[PDB]
Structure 1
Amino acid sequence: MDIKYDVVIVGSGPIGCTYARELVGAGYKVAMFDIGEIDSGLKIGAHKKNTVEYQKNIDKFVNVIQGQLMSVSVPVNTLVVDTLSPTSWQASTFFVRNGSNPEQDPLRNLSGQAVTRVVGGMSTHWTCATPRFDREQRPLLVKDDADADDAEWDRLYTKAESYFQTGTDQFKESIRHNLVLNKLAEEYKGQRDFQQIPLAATRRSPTFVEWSSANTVFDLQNRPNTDAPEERFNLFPAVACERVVRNALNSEIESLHIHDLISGDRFEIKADVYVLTAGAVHNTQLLVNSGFGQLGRPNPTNPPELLPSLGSYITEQSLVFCQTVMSTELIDSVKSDMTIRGTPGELTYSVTYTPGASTNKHPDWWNEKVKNHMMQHQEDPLPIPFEDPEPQVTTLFQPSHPWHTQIHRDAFSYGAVQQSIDSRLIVDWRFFGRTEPKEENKLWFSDKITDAYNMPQPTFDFRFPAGRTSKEAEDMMTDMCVMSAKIGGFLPGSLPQFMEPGLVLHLGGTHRMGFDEKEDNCCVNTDSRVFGFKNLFLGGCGNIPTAYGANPTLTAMSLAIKSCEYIKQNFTPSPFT
């Protein structure tokens, strides 16, 4: 490790890797630190679902996700256990136990909020949905010219889509995908459009998809190397970044304090440019530990002079979920072109279709799959092939329906026991609401309590705002109930419900963007530069200042690309030496 770099990046998630891809490519001497370690095999920071074994056992990947989601703020537990043996030591109070945060009001929390500390961040396990935001959900990059704003976002999103390898074609030959999409498309009378979820992924075979990740964006190999002999990049895992050192004027960062978790030793690293991409929670934590904002319980009587909007106006999406069991009508529709005679398993049974007939509702590729499955597996009562890929359907956020939708199969909440209902019948429904930014909704950090890395303990003070946000959230629930019914009834044990606040992991606005610090109640400008500072940039969903329902990562990446352009325009790389 050197003591001086051109650029230091904190965090090796997909957003930190966006900065690495852009700036390593442009010739900067870059160092990247991550508190977590190299996990994913020899492709550093890659998607953990890209093993042959997981894609043959997709029901097991939920466990991998759960194993790297560490809760942000757990309130003191008040469950009464009164069936202990009289001999066992028994509490007299509900004291602070087992990592709980005594600052946390359990009734004003994001209990589901969690963080992932591994190289590649949450992109080692994510669902890879990368929709664009429409104007209604999106911050302005150009103030008073909507066409210019549109053109800027189109350019950035197109580049981000390339970095992530976003596509909308990978599930086109799925019978289940078609069954669902086709039904919904026909039922909404032209007024809501259904398409494939945009997914950061490349199909390699009919039963394997290479899901994208941080590694897709930037391979995280140290440089120079044979393939990039004139690039300069070092990744340092197991390094907790603790403090950026401000000058007196709050115009420059002069150093980064790091803690090597293997040796235990602490160091300071100099750079020309500091980029914080540690996640929406941990960017904020690092800044607060560095003297930005206000440490401790908020108090308006003494509001912070440095970045007063930091940790305020936080947003998290409402999330509703259910699963459905495909309707009899839809299952029969799969085989509607078949002539079926006799009884399965008996000598005289047959399933035939007429290739190319005009009366057929499906193309030959579909009917071949169905016929062969029905004839070769007469023990099986469904017409859907066993290896048929999952549905991946959305109708995107619109004014009339201001929520994102995913009608799909997610690796999350498989759970623990095998499904009794055939998997080919099951479809997940996830609708995601937008949350109004409100000053009262805060992420703050204790001045006494510390987390597992001896850093100020995060605490939420959050409620979904009472007006539009709440009305829309409940309307969203209703919409999922109505729309899902067109596909099938609810699966027992996966009935319509709101998920624990924050379990969705789409937190934004913790270090939010705008044009003017005071007027727009914000922390970074449109180049993601922290107001007042020449050389400090923040990347991630914490920059997004708007109420958004769609998945935020692509938007955050687009903002990071724009920020890198600024850096390239304003800092000279050091000579390669």
Structure 2
Amino acid sequence: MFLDTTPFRADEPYDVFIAGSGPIGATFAKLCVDANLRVCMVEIGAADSFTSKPMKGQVPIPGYHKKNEIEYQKDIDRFVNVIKGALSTCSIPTSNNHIATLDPSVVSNSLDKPFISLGKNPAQNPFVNLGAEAVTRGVGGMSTAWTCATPEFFAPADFNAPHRERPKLSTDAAEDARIWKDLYAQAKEIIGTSTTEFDHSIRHNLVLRKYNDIFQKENVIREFSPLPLACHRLTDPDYVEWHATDRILEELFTDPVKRGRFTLLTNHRCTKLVFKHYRPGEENEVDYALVEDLLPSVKKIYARSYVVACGAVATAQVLANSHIPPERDATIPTPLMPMLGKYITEQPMTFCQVVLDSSLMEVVRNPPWPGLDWWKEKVARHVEAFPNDPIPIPFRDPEPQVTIKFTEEHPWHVQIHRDAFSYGAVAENMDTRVIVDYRFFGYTEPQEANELVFQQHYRDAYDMPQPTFKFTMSQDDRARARRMMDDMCNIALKIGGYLPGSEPQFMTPGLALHLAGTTRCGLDTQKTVGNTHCKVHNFNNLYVGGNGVIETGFAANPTLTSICYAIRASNDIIAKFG
């Protein structure tokens, strides 16, 4: 499927070239096209997911949320399959395990002759990996499948605190605050953030109000709030529209004026960028982008500015690949961008599910909180239709969406909800109405030694250099992780008992996919890849984008914040190339 956007023309240079049709990549697209810039966007995957909008006879819009389709609203459990089908794992270490019970006549690996597994990475030490780190390919990137939770990152009162989630945009605290407030407001409106979309679910209120009551009668008080979600409940309240790249790009299809300033080539790989020259430590510039059409031909695409917004892993993979101008575990040296792939950070996650205390069904039948006439009605109604239901919760009552915002007191991010990305077999003997998920995300200190590198002699499925992780938690990273488990166990048991198979546990490293710091951006030029406008040092026309630009160790979901950097970088591009 091939979008009939503006057709590529050669040697009439674009204003902005953009790699990646993720929500971040889309943000550059919307804002630059808003500024009457002419934009060419490439995307390695396909246009896989559509919605329609009237022109200003209807216009397909790609990058829609696959969870939006009605079969996934009627049957949420089925959706984990789309996710598993979307995700491609970055680094799978090789192995040579012996199958003892093979028919002795069949082909078999030996000690000195293991199989040669295509795609698996011979350089990956399995002990320093992010084994569950993975990527999605397609218009909209990971946004056609995401959870849609968009908190702000935490800013401590002391601007010089030992730790912060929200990175510094300036050395002036009054000014730092100022920009972030503006960036945050805008990103929220871009992506469709709301905290009221579940204010009429019985489960959501049950879990939220009770936790608040419980934790005011405590030594340490904890504050429970609605997880900020990028979504809006639809006029039929059985349904929700989850937001994705579609609402960002919307007007680039829907507005004939803007539609002419925007090109999107799907199934196109940005292989690398070619520079004016290849000398470290002195001013430089992107000459063109090596784009390859993957449909079963090679293009040099010119533009006045360039954005790599291919997700945290791939963005670095392009800039790494670009170091090759046109023993066996050797990596590609990136001296043109020394800080590339250093200080990488990824969140430990703990997980469990509980079954609500039967005590709380009483609550459901007779809630002590006021202005709950809707709840009492839905309940009273349900028990009409189903006199013999153990659970008085209405059949299609939405899941809880509760969070606890980070504090330096409890330096981790908590989600109390139901996620579409189940981690095991659906518990078939327990009703879904009484299951609650807990996911606690920790943060990790940025250190130089923690690296994402790229192999010279190893290529992934798309002919790009193989990513290799070298990640080891720090000692205070581990103390915090432990405190986080404890916190989860305590908190969850306040309202339920662990649902068997979903007991307290750490998930495989990288599972959260909040990998950050791969092309990191901030005020310290020496240790970053880019400045606070996400411009790459020594390159006038080259910008990065995505979670890889985040220079801090943070616990919350990164997208909203990466959109802030997209706004900021887009404005620098606009102010330089208008």
- TM norm structure 2: 0.90
2:163 equivalent to 1:109: no
The equivalent of 1:335 in structure 2 is: 365
Question: What amino acid maps onto 1:58 in structure 2?
Answer: I
CA contact (8 A) 1:297 1:444 kept: no
The equivalent of 2:3 in structure 1 is: none
The runs of 5 or more residues in structure 2 that have no matched partner are 1-7, 51-59, 156-163
Q: CA deviation at 1:231?
A: 4.6
CA–CA separation in structure 1 for the residues paired with 2:187 and 2:78:
30
Select 1:411's aligned residue among 404, 411, 420. 420
CA–CA separation in structure 2 for the residues paired with 1:155 and 1:424:
39
Select 1:547's aligned residue among 518, 543, 553. 553
Equivalent residues in 2 for 1:380-391 (5 A)?
380-391=389-400
CA contact (8 A) 1:75 1:102 kept: yes
The equivalent of 1:131 in structure 2 is: 151
2:521 equivalent to 1:513: yes
Are the structure 2 counterparts of residues 437 and 146 from structure 1 closer, same or farther at C-alpha, using a change threshold of 3 Å?
same
User: How large is the Cα RMSD of the aligned pairs?
Assistant: 2.0
2:70 equivalent to 1:39: no
CA contact (8 A) 1:62 1:415 kept: no
Q: CA deviation at 1:319?
A: 0.5
Q: CA deviation at 1:401?
A: 0.7
Question: What amino acid maps onto 1:153 in structure 2?
Answer: W
Q: More displaced, 524-533 or 509-518?
A: 509-518
The equivalent of 1:350 in structure 2 is: none
CA contact (8 A) 1:5 1:31 kept: yes
Are the structure 2 counterparts of residues 379 and 528 from structure 1 closer, same or farther at C-alpha, using a change threshold of 3 Å?
same
CA–CA separation in structure 1 for the residues paired with 2:484 and 2:97:
32
CA contact (8 A) 1:19 1:560 kept: yes
Question: What amino acid maps onto 2:336 in structure 1?
Answer: L
CA–CA separation in structure 1 for the residues paired with 2:441 and 2:166:
15
The equivalent of 2:241 in structure 1 is: 210
Q: Could you say what secondary structure the match of 1:137 adopts?
A: coil
Select 2:499's aligned residue among 480, 491, 516. 491
Q: CA deviation at 1:106?
A: 0.9
Identity percentage of aligned residues: 46
2:116 equivalent to 1:96: yes
2:169 equivalent to 1:169: no
CA contact (8 A) 1:44 1:221 kept: no
2:264 equivalent to 1:256: no
Are the structure 2 counterparts of residues 291 and 250 from structure 1 closer, same or farther at C-alpha, using a change threshold of 3 Å?
farther
2:122 equivalent to 1:122: no
The equivalent of 1:61 in structure 2 is: 79
CA–CA separation in structure 1 for the residues paired with 2:258 and 2:486:
57
The equivalent of 1:276 in structure 2 is: 308
CA–CA separation in structure 2 for the residues paired with 1:423 and 1:279:
34
Instruction: Give deviations 1:173-206, integer Å, cap 9, x for gaps.
Output: 1111111111211222283211110000011021
Equivalent residues in 2 for 1:48-447 (5 A)?
48-93=66-111, 94-135=114-155, 136-143=164-171, 145-189=172-216, 191-204=221-234, 205-219=236-250, 221=252, 227-228=256-257, 231-248=260-277, 250-263=283-296, 265-291=297-323, 305-336=335-366, 363-413=372-422, 415-417=424-426, 419-447=428-456
The runs of 5 or more residues in structure 1 that have no matched partner are 338-358, 573-577
Q: CA deviation at 1:229?
A: 5.6
Instruction: Give deviations 1:476-501, integer Å, cap 9, x for gaps.
Output: 01100000011101110111111000
CA–CA separation in structure 2 for the residues paired with 1:369 and 1:556:
40
Are the structure 2 counterparts of residues 53 and 553 from structure 1 closer, same or farther at C-alpha, using a change threshold of 3 Å?
same
2:458 equivalent to 1:449: yes
CA contact (8 A) 2:334 2:340 kept: no
CA contact (8 A) 2:197 2:232 kept: yes
- Kindly tell me the number of residue pairs found equivalent between the two proteins: 541
Q: CA deviation at 1:335?
A: 1.2
CA–CA separation in structure 1 for the residues paired with 2:330 and 2:186:
40
Question: What amino acid maps onto 1:510 in structure 2?
Answer: T
Are the structure 2 counterparts of residues 220 and 445 from structure 1 closer, same or farther at C-alpha, using a change threshold of 3 Å?
farther
CA contact (8 A) 1:44 1:220 kept: no
Higher gyration radius (CA): 1
Q: Could you say what secondary structure the match of 1:532 adopts?
A: coil
Q: CA deviation at 1:363?
A: 2.2
Question: What amino acid maps onto 1:73 in structure 2?
Answer: S
Q: CA deviation at 1:227?
A: 4.3
CA contact (8 A) 2:30 2:252 kept: no
Instruction: Give deviations 1:398-444, integer Å, cap 9, x for gaps.
Output: 11111011000100016445631010100000000010001111101
Question: What amino acid maps onto 2:189 in structure 1?
Answer: S
Are the structure 2 counterparts of residues 509 and 220 from structure 1 closer, same or farther at C-alpha, using a change threshold of 3 Å?
farther
CA contact (8 A) 1:76 1:95 kept: no
Q: Could you say what secondary structure the match of 2:405 adopts?
A: coil
CA–CA separation in structure 1 for the residues paired with 2:260 and 2:182:
26
CA–CA separation in structure 1 for the residues paired with 2:88 and 2:198:
32
CA contact (8 A) 1:54 1:60 kept: yes
- TM norm structure 1: 0.90
CA–CA separation in structure 1 for the residues paired with 2:306 and 2:456:
25
CA–CA separation in structure 2 for the residues paired with 1:237 and 1:131:
31
Instruction: Give deviations 1:41-61, integer Å, cap 9, x for gaps.
Output: 343011110011110010000
CA–CA separation in structure 2 for the residues paired with 1:261 and 1:431:
39
Instruction: Give deviations 1:291-317, integer Å, cap 9, x for gaps.
Output: 189x98679xx9753221111110000
Q: More displaced, 303-312 or 496-505?
A: 303-312
Q: Could you say what secondary structure the match of 2:316 adopts?
A: helix
Q: More displaced, 541-550 or 241-250?
A: 241-250
CA contact (8 A) 1:96 1:102 kept: no
CA–CA separation in structure 1 for the residues paired with 2:312 and 2:169:
20
Are the structure 2 counterparts of residues 196 and 162 from structure 1 closer, same or farther at C-alpha, using a change threshold of 3 Å?
same
Instruction: Give deviations 1:493-518, integer Å, cap 9, x for gaps.
Output: 11111100001100000010111321
Q: CA deviation at 1:77?
A: 2.4
The equivalent of 2:4 in structure 1 is: none
CA contact (8 A) 2:275 2:286 kept: yes
CA contact (8 A) 2:44 2:266 kept: yes
CA–CA separation in structure 2 for the residues paired with 1:330 and 1:360:
13
The equivalent of 2:159 in structure 1 is: none
Q: More displaced, 49-58 or 36-45?
A: 36-45
Q: CA deviation at 1:78?
A: 3.4
